[PDB]
Amino acid sequence: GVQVETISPGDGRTFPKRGQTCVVHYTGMLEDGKKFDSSRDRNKPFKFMLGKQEVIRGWEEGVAQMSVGQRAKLTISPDYAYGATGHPGIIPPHATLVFDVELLKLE
Numbered sequence: 001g002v003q004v005e006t007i008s009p010g011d012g013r014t015f016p017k018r019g020q021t022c023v024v025h026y027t028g029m030l031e032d033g034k035k036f037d038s039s040r041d042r043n044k045p046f047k048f049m050l051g052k053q054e055v056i057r058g059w060e061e062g063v064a065q066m067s068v069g070q071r072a073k074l075t076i077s078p079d080y081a082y083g084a085t086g087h088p089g090i091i092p093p094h095a096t097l098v099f100d101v102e103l104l105k106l107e
């Protein structure tokens with residue numbers, strides 16, 4: 001599944017609902033620590049809509065647990081990420097992933 005470990009607290013009140021757009025910054029790394037992506041390096045917040053099957057299960061369920069302003073470490077088992085398939089040339093098969101995610105606002 002997905003573990004959510006808080007880095008910095010959010011408001012504890014405003015949680016994303018199905019049909020709302022989450023605006024986040026994130027960094028993604030493999031379990032061994034190798035960074036593979038960062039919206040911060042891209043200098044553009046990442047947007048996705050909850051309930052629209054847009055993101056890996058670990059995100060769909062992990063970000064749902066966050067409130068606006070919260071920064072958290074999401075540790076995600078391969079089955080809640082890219083599984084045995086992986087993501088060609090980025091995510092190897094059977095990868096546990098770690099995301100640093102900050103929920104900036106809802107739209």
Ligand SMILES: CC[C@@H]1/C=C(\C)[C@@H](O)[C@H](C)C[C@H](OC)[C@H]2O[C@@](O)(C(=O)C(=O)N3CCCC[C@H]3C(=O)O[C@H](/C(C)=C/[C@@H]3CC[C@@H](O)[C@H](OC)C3)[C@H](C)[C@@H](O)CC1=O)[C@H](C)C[C@@H]2OC
Pocket residue numbers: 026028036037046054055056059081082083087090091
């Ligand atoms: C068509 C291009 C389209 C690309 C964009 C909109 C880009 O602008 C984004 C900024 C994405 C990044 O582009 C540089 C890049 O992000 C990663 O690096 C990454 O950090 C990641 O893991 N993310 C992104 C942040 C949210 C969680 C997760 C994800 O869920 O991503 C989603 C994802 C890949 C879902 C799979 C869909 C197929 C299912 O079969 C599989 O089911 C297991 C899940 C992603 C947002 C898709 O909805 C949309 C796209 O892929 C991926 C390793 C590879 C991906 O590039 C492709």
